[PDB]
DNA sequence: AAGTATTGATATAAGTAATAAATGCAAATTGC
DNA sequence: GCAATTTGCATTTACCGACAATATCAATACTT
RNA sequence: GUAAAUG
């Protein structure tokens, strides 16, 4: 049976939808049961293996496992039970005076509802499944997650209950539960073993605990493992029965739940949440907020469209896969099968220790390799296992947010974000007509497939037309021939496209062909590209695609000039690397460098890709650090010389950002915080997307405390603690979390449209998937978008955004004593101080502040005449226009922040016209 | 005939790497008196004398020209000190070492093929007379190195194959309240453990007067420290310096064994015996209930336990049946 | 006055050492 | 003001000399 | 922490 094969053969559309219609019914019980969760049937499995081996009389206690696990949970539930009772007896007491008990009840409310049954399924199977987790085999786990998994374990289990029908558990909670529990565990599980006495040499039968409690050095700190005896070992080894509660996630067989609440949607039965917040409270919190006034309508429909599409395997392109990896060998990507590591000869031990560091490093580099060709092989199977299994079935693939709005999907193993691999094995499950112009653009995607994008559109289907003879060739014989794909820049998409096109030629009117191969359209230098629209400047907005042209202008080909240019002047000097990378510089070792400038990439990022770029040449093969940096200086003042509009809107972002990181609120800091002289900032810069999607950035000191449990005390982190924010990462993190932001609100919009005109959509950040019918009609969708998400100026939005939401807050400044105009805030700090009767310092500054407002937001008009006549420090700052010019004791500045970069004249409506803006 | 460098001359010095030295010849033969290291090596030609960081040298100026061995070795790494060092002795009988005692295969090599320096072997029966060590560690961060001698005194690996070697040790005055630490005291480590067990130890010297407190009062007394001021050691931004004397001895036990079971029980030192059994394995505790038979020692914290009570648990830890592989670990 | 509790420091092990030499990215940030 | 100084966009996967360290004790803080 | 992938 294959239901992609069936529906090719399906010859009319009205049967195709019928068929359809019985295709989802037939697969709503396998996506119940692929979505399953096993804390249910594991209990009854072993309740079942436990009575027919007592019905038995005799067994084994390798198949005796599951008898045992009957065991330790009827041995568990009684104390489970027993501290449900005191959870009731604790909770259930009006009166709250505490007579300095020992006992805790904050767990307690945690773990009262539900956790009197299938508590030890989560035990059991968790505390079994981290068997070497963390190299605690030296056999065990470290108890730092192993009391956190079991607790996130035992929330998710509340969550996904409650679909069914203290939203988010601290970290505290999570591992006291956690805790708790695990040492109940411990308490009742036992195991037999038999061992030999040391004197007289006889054997012994004697049952021992099996899991123990432990610690361990590290370089001399203590880590506080959790250990599991050599029978469990044994006995879990020789079965394989991991029989784990959570399943991988895979790609789902029926249409997704459309998305409703931030966390209603996405899997059937398994709860998502809209936004991949890294259990940040404030995130949480802004995001529930937004959903629950309801402004993020075109977010959810953009997300519907882009989780709506069906995909399906190639089955032609994974005959070739599976054919190399049965072969095993190195390939264009697949690094092929190491069997052993090969250890190098040493140098006797009497040579040098130069030369015993060297060998060792030789060591150390053989051991890396055999590790990341291990890695990678372990990645490629685990990604063809997934493909064999699905192969012929109706994919789907639904889509989640991170805390910026990048849409990515909710399987990470198998999707179309991944390698070339990953995107050549997969195809449209949809079959479109071709028509007139499909033909054009299947030879256009296969042109800019091979990287010669460069070039205009005519000139890219010339160079499809000389090559079709080797596209029939390889896509006749995929291996055994000239193996021509293997030479394009992305081979698996370039192999599909070839037996695509073949088809398409073998055929005679390629009109009536029916393709299902998508065809990217992708923009070059989207955060260029945004910069550009946003400044409007026509200098960088012709040099990157936005103005209407014939010949599409290569950015990467004119950095890539530059760069030779100063590499040649660099060589008549005459620098040694200069001569050596003078004449071998392209496109491709400064792409990367320039895509990810605008992104915020550092000198050391960009030295990695750099580098990364460089070393398949091998030309610079045994080192190429010195070379990477030097180059890398070069492109950055390549870069600098290149881009001056991007740059003002960049330092803008980054100084408002440090200005909102250096801010005090003026109520919630009137409360004593302990240290008085000194604030603390608690404020992180937050605005929304022109959609209605408010981001809020995480970036805080998170610091590790020791939190008091049964078992130990673990060293963790609780991030519901409120914690200063991190100046320098918000500063370095606000630009390109804009740019970011900006391209989601387009990709959401052109999702939108797409679907609502009836097209099949599946982007991949900047690049848009189409049928090669499509395209055309996407393309004037995505120009339309992109037209409504520029007509406004968006950065002056966001200045008023930011003025608006922080309109009473301070900041905090050090200013000379010198200053006239500081004499005056002494002036008015000496009376302040006197009528209070103790010293005045900032807290009191603030409180005056306070009080101020107090007296000016009073909609009593008798209330506003006393604001007035009250002067304050914030006071004295209302008649000074630029406090920079005014800017030895610290002092209290209002919050300004500066006004928005010149704007240059633009009208960006120009682009519909264009063509090679977005190709 | 060997001339002390001067105080002005130490003072020239630039490099010091954070060892604190002493430049008093009225200290160094007060402590020498006290010491009297003539008793147990009673030929002063016979003695052969190694030392580990020498540092300016004026110890060891101080010690060739009171008894004159028949070869002083002084094993230094550092530049400006061995500058020093050369200049300042030459021409004297004094031999002069450029290695570095951290590197193991440096007394490997001294010792075993190219012989420059040779030494005696003696049996373990009585304290050695040929061989004498003295070394400087006070540095703050090489406080390591200093139970890795001590475990070498166990493992009669790196010098004690030579026999029983007394050593004196300059040691900062923190290290040695953590060695010299008595059963029940704050300062109780497996440091401690390790020197009751290898070692017989005697504080000779201590600057800090104040520091004195730390220590128990009747190993105070009976030791007599040479207290000495704060400001006669060159370097005075650094912690106060104390001097010790190690004698190994002998001893009867798996020390194997006898370090795990030490090591895993003084990571809980004040929980008592009566639960932290089971630590060391899987029904330990049980099978610890079982076997011991004194209700003191199963109420006691491995704080306040002694090196006998420490053995004995050790032996009950063998005669275990079920006794995991420490090897392992 | 009686207390009790939350916070902060220090040690732990022992060859991925230390200290000074070395070197490089610079810059936005953190000590005095 | 001055010297040093420690990092610097998002998402996912695999692997490991090993990754969120823990026990105890005193000093400050709070409550009665 | 190491490596890789994507933008
Ligand atoms: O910088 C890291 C590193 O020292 C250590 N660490 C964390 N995970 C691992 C691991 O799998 N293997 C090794 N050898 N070391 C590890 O902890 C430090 C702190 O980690 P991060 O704060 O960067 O957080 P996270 O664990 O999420 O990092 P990563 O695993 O995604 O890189």
Same mark, same amino acid.
């Not at chain 1, 709503?28 to 019905?55: C, G, P, S, Y």
């Not at chain 2, 790497?17 to 003539?38: E, R, S």
């Given at each position: 049976?294959?239901?992609?094969?069936?529906?090719?053969?399906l010859?009319?559309?009205?049967?195709?939808?019928?068929?359809?219609?019985?295709?989802?019914?037939?697969?709503?019980?396998?996506?119940?049961?692929?979505?399953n969760?096993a804390?249910?049937?594991a209990?009854?499995?072993?309740?079942?293996?436990?009575?027919e081996?007592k019905?038995?009389?005799?067994?084994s206690?390798?198949?005796?496992?599951?008898?045992?696990?009957?065991?330790?949970?009827?041995?568990?539930?009684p104390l489970?039970?027993?501290?449900?009772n005191?959870?009731?007896?604790?909770?259930?007491?009006?009166?709250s005076?505490?007579?300095?008990?020992?006992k805790?009840?904050?767990?307690?409310?945690?773990?009262?509802?539900?956790?009197?049954?299938?508590?030890?399924?989560?035990?059991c199977?968790?505390?079994?499944?981290?068997?070497?987790?963390?190299?605690?085999?030296?056999?065990?786990?470290?108890?730092?997650?192993?009391v956190?998994?079991?607790?996130k374990?035992?929330?998710?289990?509340?969550?996904?209950?409650?679909?069914?029908?203290?939203?988010?558990?601290?970290?505290s909670?999570?591992?006291?539960?956690?805790?708790?529990?695990?040492?109940?565990?411990?308490?009742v599980?036992?195991?037999?073993? /038999?061992?030999?006495?040391?004197?007289?040499?006889?054997?012994?039968?004697?049952?021992?605990?099996?899991?123990?409690?432990?610690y361990?050095?590290?370089?001399?700190?203590?880590?506080?493992?959790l250990?599991?005896?050599?029978?469990?070992?044994?006995?879990?080894?020789?079965?394989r029965?991991?029989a784990?509660?959570?399943?991988?996630?895979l790609?789902m067989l029926?249409?997704?739940?459309?998305?409703?609440?931030?966390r209603?949607?996405?899997?059937?039965?398994?709860?998502?949440?809209?936004?991949?917040?890294? $259990?940040?409270?404030? /995130?949480?919190?802004?995001?529930?907020?937004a959903?629950?006034?309801?402004?993020?309508?075109?977010?959810?429909?953009?997300?519907?469209?882009?989780?709506?599409?069906?995909?399906?395997?190639?089955?032609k392109?994974?005959?070739?896969?599976?054919?190399?990896?049965?072969?095993?060998?190195?390939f264009?990507?697949?690094?092929?099968?190491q069997?052993?590591?090969?250890?190098?000869?040493?140098?006797?031990?009497?040579?040098?220790?130069?030369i015993?560091?060297?060998?060792?490093? /030789?060591?150390?580099?053989?051991?890396?390799?055999?590790?990341?060709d291990?890695?990678?092989?372990?990645?490629?199977?685990?990604?063809?296992?997934?493909?064999?299994?699905?192969?012929?079935?109706?994919?789907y693939?639904?889509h989640?947010?991170?805390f910026?709005?990048?849409?990515?999907?909710?399987?990470?193993?198998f999707?179309?974000?991944?390698? $070339?691999?990953?995107?050549?094995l997969?195809?449209?499950?949809?079959?479109k007509?071709?028509?007139?112009?499909?033909?054009?653009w299947?030879?256009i995607?296969?042109?800019?497939?091979?990287?010669?994008?460069?070039?205009?559109?005519?000139?890219?289907?010339?160079?499809?037309?000389?090559?079709?003879?080797?596209?029939?060739?390889?896509?006749?014989?995929?291996?055994?021939?000239?193996?021509?794909?293997?030479?394009?820049?992305?081979?698996?998409?370039?192999?599909?496209?070839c037996?695509?096109?073949?088809?398409?030629?073998?055929?005679?009117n390629?009109?009536?062909?029916?393709?299902?191969?998508?065809?990217?359209? $992708?923009?070059?230098?989207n955060?260029?590209?945004?910069?550009?629209?946003?400044?409007?400047?026509?200098?960088?907005?012709?040099?990157?695609?936005?103005?209407?042209?014939?010949?599409?202008?290569?950015?990467?080909?004119?950095?890539?000039?530059?760069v030779?240019?100063?590499?040649?002047?660099?060589?008549?000097?005459?620098?040694?690397?200069?001569?050596?990378?003078?004449?071998?510089?392209?496109r491709?070792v400064?792409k990367?460098?320039?895509?990810?400038?605008?992104?915020?990439?550092?000198?050391?990022?960009?030295?990695?890709?750099?580098?990364?770029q460089?070393?398949?040449?091998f030309?610079?093969?045994?080192?190429?650090?010195?070379?990477?940096?030097?180059?890398?200086?070069?492109?950055?003042?390549?870069?600098?010389?290149?881009?001056?509009?991007?740059?003002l809107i960049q330092?803008?972002?980054?100084?408002?950002?440090?200005?909102?990181?250096?801010?005090?609120?003026?109520?919630?800091?009137?409360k004593?915080?302990?240290?008085?002289?000194?604030?603390?900032?608690?404020?992180?810069?937050?605005?929304?997307?022109?959609?209605?999607?408010?981001?809020?950035?995480?970036?805080?000191?998170?610091?590790?405390?020791?939190?008091?449990?049964?078992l130990?005390?673990?060293?963790?982190?609780?991030?519901?603690?409120?914690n200063?924010?991190?100046?320098?990462?918000?500063?370095?993190?606000?630009?390109?979390?804009?740019?970011?932001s900006?391209?989601?609100?387009?990709?959401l919009?052109?999702?939108?449209?797409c679907?609502?005109?009836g097209?099949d959509?599946?982007?991949?950040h900047?690049?848009?998937?189409?049928?090669a019918?499509?395209?055309?009609?996407?393309?004037?969708?995505?120009?339309?978008?992109?037209?409504?998400?520029?007509?406004v100026?968006?950065?002056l939005?966001?200045?008023?955004?930011?003025?608006?939401?922080?309109?009473?807050?301070?900041?905090?400044?050090?200013?000379?004593r010198?200053?006239?105009?500081?004499?005056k805030?002494?002036?008015?700090?000496?009376?302040?101080?006197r009528?209070?009767?103790?010293?005045?310092?900032?807290?009191?500054?603030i409180?005056?502040?306070?009080?101020?407002?107090?007296?000016?937001?009073?909609?009593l008009?008798?209330?506003?005449?006393?604001?007035?006549?009250?002067?304050?420090?914030?006071?004295?700052?209302?008649?000074?226009?630029?406090?920079?010019?005014?800017?030895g004791?610290?002092?209290?500045?209002?919050?300004?922040?500066?006004?928005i970069?010149?704007?240059?004249?633009?009208?960006?409506?120009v682009?519909?016209?264009?063509?090679?803006?977005?190709? | 005939?060997?001339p002390?460098?001067?105080?002005?001359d130490?003072?020239k010095?630039?490099?010091?790497?954070?060892?604190?030295?002493?430049?008093?010849?009225?200290?160094?033969?007060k402590?020498?008196?006290?010491?009297?290291?003539?008793?147990?090596?009673?030929?002063?030609?016979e003695?052969?004398?190694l030392?580990?960081?020498?540092?300016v040298?004026?110890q060891?100026?101080?010690?060739?020209?009171?008894?004159?061995?028949?070869?002083?070795?002084?094993?230094?790494?550092?530049?400006?000190?061995y500058?020093?060092?050369?200049?300042?002795?030459?021409?004297?009988?004094?031999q002069?070492?450029?290695?570095?005692?951290?590197?193991?295969?440096?007394?490997?090599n001294?010792?075993?093929?190219?012989?420059?320096?040779?030494?005696?072997?003696?049996?373990?029966?009585?304290?050695?007379?040929?061989?004498l060590?003295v070394?400087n560690?006070?540095?703050?961060?090489?406080?390591?190195?200093?139970?890795?001698?001590?475990?070498?005194?166990?493992?009669?690996?790196?010098?004690?194959?030579?026999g029983?070697?007394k050593m004196?040790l300059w040691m900062?005055?923190?290290?040695?309240?953590?060695?010299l630490?008595?059963?029940?005291?704050?300062?109780?480590?497996?440091?401690?453990?390790?020197?009751?067990?290898?070692?017989?130890?005697?504080?000779?010297?201590?600057?800090?007067?104040?520091?004195?407190?730390?220590?128990?009062?009747?190993?105070?007394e009976e030791?007599?420290?040479?207290?000495?001021?704060?400001?006669?050691?060159?370097?005075?931004?650094?912690?106060?310096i104390?001097?010790?004397?190690?004698?190994?001895?002998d001893?009867?036990?798996?020390?194997?064994?006898?370090?795990?079971?030490?090591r895993?029980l003084?990571?809980?030192?004040?929980?008592?015996?009566?639960?932290?059994?089971?630590?060391?394995?899987?029904?330990?505790?049980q099978?610890?209930?079982?076997?011991?038979?004194?209700?003191?020692?199963?109420?006691?914290?491995?704080?306040?336990?002694?090196?006998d009570?420490?053995?004995?648990?050790?032996?009950?830890?063998?005669?275990?049946?079920?006794?995991?592989?420490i090897l392992?670990?």
């Amino acid at each position: 049976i294959n239901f992609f094969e069936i529906y090719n053969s399906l010859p009319t559309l009205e049967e195709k939808k019928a068929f359809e219609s019985a295709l989802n019914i037939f697969n709503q019980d396998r996506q119940k049961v692929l979505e399953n969760r096993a804390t249910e049937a594991a209990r009854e499995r072993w309740k079942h293996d436990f009575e027919e081996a007592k019905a038995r009389g005799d067994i084994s206690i390798e198949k005796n496992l599951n008898v045992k696990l009957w065991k330790w949970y009827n041995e568990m539930l009684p104390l489970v039970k027993e501290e449900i009772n005191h959870c009731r007896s604790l909770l259930s007491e009006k009166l709250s005076d505490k007579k300095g008990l020992n006992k805790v009840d904050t767990n307690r409310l945690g773990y009262g509802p539900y956790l009197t049954l299938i508590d030890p399924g989560k035990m059991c199977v968790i505390t079994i499944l981290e068997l070497l987790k963390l190299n605690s085999t030296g056999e065990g786990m470290r108890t730092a997650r192993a009391v956190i998994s079991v607790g996130k374990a035992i929330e998710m289990e509340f969550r996904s209950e409650q679909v069914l029908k203290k939203i988010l558990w601290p970290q505290s909670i999570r591992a006291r539960i956690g805790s708790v529990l695990i040492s109940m565990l411990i308490q009742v599980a036992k195991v037999s073993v /038999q061992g030999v006495d040391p004197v007289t040499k006889a054997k012994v039968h004697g049952e021992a605990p099996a899991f123990a409690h432990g610690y361990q050095y590290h370089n001399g700190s203590k880590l506080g493992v959790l250990k599991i005896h050599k029978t469990l070992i044994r006995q879990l080894n020789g079965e394989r029965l991991i029989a784990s509660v959570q399943p991988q996630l895979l790609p789902m067989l029926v249409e997704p739940k459309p998305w409703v609440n931030w966390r209603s949607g996405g899997y059937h039965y398994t709860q998502s949440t809209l936004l991949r917040t890294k $259990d940040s409270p404030e /995130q949480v919190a802004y995001l529930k907020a937004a959903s629950d006034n309801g402004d993020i309508d075109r977010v959810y429909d953009g997300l519907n469209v882009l989780g709506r599409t069906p995909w399906t395997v190639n089955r032609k392109v994974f005959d070739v896969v599976s054919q190399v990896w049965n072969k095993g060998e190195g390939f264009l990507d697949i690094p092929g099968a190491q069997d052993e590591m090969v250890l190098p000869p040493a140098p006797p031990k009497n040579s040098d220790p130069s030369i015993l560091r060297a060998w060792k490093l /030789q060591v150390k580099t053989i051991a890396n390799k055999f590790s990341s060709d291990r890695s990678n092989r372990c990645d490629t199977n685990y990604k063809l296992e997934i493909a064999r299994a699905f192969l012929g079935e109706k994919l789907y693939f639904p889509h989640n947010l991170d805390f910026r709005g990048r849409a990515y999907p909710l399987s990470p193993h198998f999707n179309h974000l991944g390698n $070339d691999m990953s995107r050549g094995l997969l195809i449209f499950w949809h079959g479109k007509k071709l028509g007139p112009s499909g033909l054009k653009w299947l030879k256009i995607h296969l042109s800019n497939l091979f990287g010669f994008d460069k070039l205009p559109l005519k000139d890219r289907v010339a160079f499809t037309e000389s090559h079709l003879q080797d596209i029939k060739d390889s896509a006749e014989n995929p291996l055994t021939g000239d193996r021509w794909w293997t030479t394009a820049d992305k081979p698996w998409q370039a192999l599909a496209t070839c037996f695509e096109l073949n088809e398409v030629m073998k055929m005679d009117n390629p009109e009536e062909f029916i393709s299902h191969q998508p065809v990217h359209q $992708d923009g070059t230098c989207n955060g260029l590209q945004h910069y550009a629209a946003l400044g409007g400047d026509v200098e960088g907005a012709t040099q990157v695609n936005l103005v209407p042209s014939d010949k599409p202008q290569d950015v990467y080909a004119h950095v890539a000039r530059l760069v030779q240019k100063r590499l040649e002047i660099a060589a008549e000097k005459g620098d040694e690397n200069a001569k050596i990378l003078k004449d071998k510089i392209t496109r491709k070792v400064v792409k990367q460098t320039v895509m990810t400038n605008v992104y915020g990439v550092t000198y050391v990022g960009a030295t990695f890709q750099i580098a990364k770029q460089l070393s398949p040449i091998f030309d610079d093969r045994k080192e190429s650090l010195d070379f990477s940096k030097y180059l890398t200086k070069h492109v950055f003042s390549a870069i600098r010389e290149l881009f001056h509009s991007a740059h003002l809107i960049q330092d803008w972002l980054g100084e408002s950002a440090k200005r909102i990181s250096k801010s005090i609120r003026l109520d919630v800091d009137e409360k004593s915080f302990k240290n008085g002289n000194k604030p603390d900032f608690m404020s992180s810069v937050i605005w929304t997307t022109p959609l209605g999607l408010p981001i809020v950035q995480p970036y805080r000191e998170e610091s590790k405390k020791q939190v008091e449990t049964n078992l130990q005390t673990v060293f963790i982190s609780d991030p519901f603690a409120v914690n200063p924010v991190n100046a320098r990462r918000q500063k370095a993190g606000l630009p390109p979390n804009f740019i970011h932001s900006l391209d989601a609100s387009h990709m959401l919009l052109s999702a939108a449209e797409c679907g609502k005109q009836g097209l099949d959509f599946a982007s991949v950040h900047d690049s848009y998937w189409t049928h090669a019918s499509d395209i055309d009609t996407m393309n004037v969708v995505l120009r339309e978008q992109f037209i409504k998400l520029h007509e406004v100026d968006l950065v002056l939005r966001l200045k008023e955004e930011f003025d608006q939401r922080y309109k009473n807050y301070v900041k905090i400044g050090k200013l000379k004593r010198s200053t006239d105009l500081a004499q005056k805030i002494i002036r008015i700090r000496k009376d302040l101080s006197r009528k209070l009767g103790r010293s005045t310092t900032l807290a009191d500054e603030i409180y005056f502040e306070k009080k101020r407002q107090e007296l000016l937001n009073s909609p009593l008009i008798e209330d506003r005449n006393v604001g007035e006549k009250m002067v304050t420090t914030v006071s004295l700052f209302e008649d000074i226009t630029d406090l920079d010019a005014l800017e030895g004791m610290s002092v209290l500045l209002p919050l300004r922040l500066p006004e928005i970069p010149p704007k240059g004249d633009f009208d960006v409506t120009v682009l519909r016209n264009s063509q090679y803006f977005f190709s | 005939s060997v001339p002390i460098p001067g105080i002005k001359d130490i003072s020239k010095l630039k490099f010091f790497y954070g060892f604190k030295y002493l430049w008093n010849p009225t200290v160094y033969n007060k402590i020498f008196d006290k010491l009297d290291l003539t008793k147990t090596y009673k030929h002063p030609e016979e003695l052969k004398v190694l030392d580990l960081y020498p540092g300016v040298g004026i110890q060891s100026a101080i010690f060739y020209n009171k008894y004159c061995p028949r070869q002083y070795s002084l094993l230094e790494k550092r530049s400006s000190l061995y500058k020093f060092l050369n200049a300042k002795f030459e021409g004297s009988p004094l031999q002069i070492l450029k290695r570095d005692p951290y590197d193991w295969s440096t007394y490997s090599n001294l010792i075993d093929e190219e012989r420059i320096f040779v030494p005696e072997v003696q049996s373990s029966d009585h304290i050695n007379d040929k061989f004498l060590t003295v070394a400087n560690v006070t540095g703050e961060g090489s406080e390591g190195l200093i139970m890795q001698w001590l475990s070498c005194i166990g493992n009669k690996n790196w010098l004690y194959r030579f026999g029983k070697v007394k050593m004196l040790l300059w040691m900062p005055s923190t290290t040695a309240r953590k060695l010299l630490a008595r059963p029940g005291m704050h300062s109780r480590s497996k440091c401690s453990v390790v020197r009751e067990a290898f070692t017989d130890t005697k504080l000779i010297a201590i600057s800090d007067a104040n520091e004195l407190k730390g220590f128990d009062s009747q190993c105070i007394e009976e030791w007599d420290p040479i207290l000495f001021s704060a400001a006669e050691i060159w370097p005075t931004k650094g912690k106060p310096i104390a001097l010790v004397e190690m004698d190994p001895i002998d001893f009867d036990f798996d020390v194997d064994n006898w370090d795990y079971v030490t090591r895993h029980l003084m990571i809980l030192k004040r929980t008592p015996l009566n639960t932290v059994m089971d630590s060391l394995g899987h029904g330990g505790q049980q099978y610890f209930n079982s076997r011991i038979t004194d209700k003191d020692l199963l109420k006691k914290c491995p704080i306040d336990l002694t090196n006998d009570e420490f053995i004995y648990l050790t032996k009950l830890f063998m005669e275990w049946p079920f006794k995991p592989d420490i090897l392992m670990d």
